[PDB]
Design an enzyme around this catalytic site. Structure first.
Site, PDB file in Angstrom:
ATOM      1  CG  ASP A  42      -1.882   1.121   1.270  1.00  0.00           C
ATOM      2  OD1 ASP A  42      -2.130   1.764   0.224  1.00  0.00           O
ATOM      3  OD2 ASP A  42      -2.380   1.387   2.385  1.00  0.00           O
ATOM      4  CG  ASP A  75       0.964   7.997  -4.097  1.00  0.00           C
ATOM      5  OD1 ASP A  75       0.662   8.585  -5.167  1.00  0.00           O
ATOM      6  OD2 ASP A  75       0.617   8.419  -2.979  1.00  0.00           O
ATOM      7  CB  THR A  96     -11.077  -0.792   4.415  1.00  0.00           C
ATOM      8  OG1 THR A  96     -11.762  -0.801   3.156  1.00  0.00           O
ATOM      9  CG2 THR A  96     -12.047  -0.343   5.474  1.00  0.00           C
ATOM     10  CB  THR A 129      -9.306   4.941   9.145  1.00  0.00           C
ATOM     11  OG1 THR A 129      -8.168   5.597   8.574  1.00  0.00           O
ATOM     12  CG2 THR A 129      -9.855   5.765  10.304  1.00  0.00           C
TER      13      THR A 129
HETATM   14 NA    NA Z   1      -2.916   0.923  -2.479  1.00  0.00          NA
HETATM   15 ZN   LIG Z   2      -3.572   8.140  -2.305  1.00  0.00          ZN
HETATM   16 ZN   LIG Z   3      -1.707   8.948  -2.319  1.00  0.00          ZN
END
Ligand code: NA
Ligand SMILES: [Zn+2]
Ligand SMILES: [Zn+2]
Ligand code: NA
Ligand SMILES: [Zn+2]
Ligand SMILES: [Zn+2]
Lengths: 278, 278
Positions: free
Chosen positions: A82, A104, A225, A227
């Site tokens: 992530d 990202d 998901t 939080t």
């Molecule tokens: Na992700």
């Molecule tokens: Zn993001």
């Molecule tokens: Zn981001």
């Protein structure tokens, strides 16, 4: 078992449901997520942030998931990085056994985002790993170009309330699984549980259930998901601390915490449409 | 690497030091024990109760330990079933990869205790696994017969003030590694940490540090350590909950909890004499 991210999300894309992507930082979170998937007959998208990976060690993050996989071999599960921030980070995850990685680069300009995403894609696809990237509010026309050029497997477009017209346009143009980031709802029962345990949420509000459902109908297939799981977990821990000042058995703290986390995951699986999809 | 319990305790036996046997119930506890052993250059005895095995699942319990062992390949590590209560439970720990098992039959009369211990020993030694048994206060002549008949690798004699004269006679008659149960020594800093976080220990009395040292001079070589770890760990969890009612990042609760547990383990290893023994 442990499968490429695209295996789970191509099916969600084709059939029009969303697969919750649930972050974990330790055994307790992972166990409750897995028990949820087993009880809902739902595929599991397991997420680990760079931070959670440093906390556990990537050897443990992968190792624990592989143990859980053998415990429920009938459940398809992807192991997904992530918000990877560097190519090297994504490569380490691929080397460690992750079956999906997100890079990202959305804070870069389009051209630099595209070039770094494409570098990660080449490396990951060569090792049979799916890639997520991020764009954005997103320009759907550059989303179309970004996906065709990068060959990324799924895209997180910036759509926010939620820009549902922009979502349908991105989906129509890209024809790939789409990802919604920061998608926790902070349900009423979880907030009430956290406040009853004495916690304070600073008036924080999530994405309401109907907007999650509408984004799945709009074409979101991966729903990040995190939080919700933590608030449901820590509220039980806070509660146990408050009620028995002599309690230091860790199981007495984390067994109810697991149960609340598992319930959030179960309900979200039902909401997004991955229940009974194995 | 993961080695027979006797391998670690035979060395402790011949050299007259003690090796702490640290219980764990999840990743956080296990990680901090290992970091303590790595920083003190001490061999690790890792213990899981039947309860903690139920909580983790025996596959995760062993799996997590095997990952940690590969992370610190230079450290001698034994994985030990604490207070196994049936033959079948010992056999399950042996089949899953434990390298030491304790059968607790001390509530039975001498003959039945010996019969059950002997059955465990034949099973565990056939698979290259060491056995602990329990006796008792202890009759040293019973201990001498019990050890010679059963061929158990180490024995927990009930010697508790703690009866130094009785311990020495048992040691002399049996000439095997000896183990001390219920030997948590609730250190002042740890107790103060728990109370500062609003905890209530009910005035629980821990064994004085001097009595742990005198048992090692008397021939104790494995010192069971659990309560101390859990108090130190949960103390920090309560502290984080108290000082930020908006905190639900699990790392923020458990990173300081790990550090407090690690420091307890490090001090114990120095106290008992396992520091710098690799
Ligand atoms: Na992700
Ligand atoms: Zn993001
Ligand atoms: Zn981001
Ligand atoms: Na034991
Ligand atoms: Zn004990
Ligand atoms: Zn005992």
């Amino acid at each position: 078992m442990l499968v490429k991210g695209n295996e789970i999300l191509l099916k969600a894309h084709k059939e029009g449901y969303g697969v919750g992507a649930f972050n974990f930082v330790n055994f307790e979170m992972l166990n409750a997520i897995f028990e949820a998937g087993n009880e809902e007959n739902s595929p599991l998208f397991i997420q680990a942030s760079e931070g959670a990976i440093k906390y556990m060690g990537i050897d443990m993050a992968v190792g624990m998931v592989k143990i859980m996989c053998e415990r429920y071999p009938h459940i398809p599960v992807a192991l997904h990085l992530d918000h990877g921030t560097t190519f090297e980070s994504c490569e380490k995850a691929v080397k460690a056994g992750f079956t999906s990685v997100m890079i990202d680069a959305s804070h870069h300009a389009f051209e630099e985002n595209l070039e770094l995403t494409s570098k990660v894609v080449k490396m990951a696809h060569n090792a049979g790993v799916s890639v997520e990237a991020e764009l954005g509010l997103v320009n759907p026309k550059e989303a179309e170009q970004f996906v065709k050029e990068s060959q990324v497997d799924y895209l997180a477009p910036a759509i926010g309330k939620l820009d549902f017209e922009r979502l349908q346009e991105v989906k129509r143009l890209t024809n790939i699984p789409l990802v919604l980031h920061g998608a926790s709802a902070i349900p009423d029962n979880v907030r009430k549980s956290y406040l009853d345990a004495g916690g304070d949420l600073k008036g924080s509000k999530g994405v309401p259930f109907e907007f999650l459902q509408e984004s799945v109908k709009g074409g979101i297939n991966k729903v990040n998901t995190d939080t919700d799981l933590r608030i449901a977990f820590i509220a039980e821990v806070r509660k146990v601390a408050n009620e028995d000042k002599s309690q230091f058995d860790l199981r007495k703290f984390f067994s109810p915490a697991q149960l609340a986390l598992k319930n959030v995951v179960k309900e979200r699986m039902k909401l997004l449409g991955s229940a009974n999809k194995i």
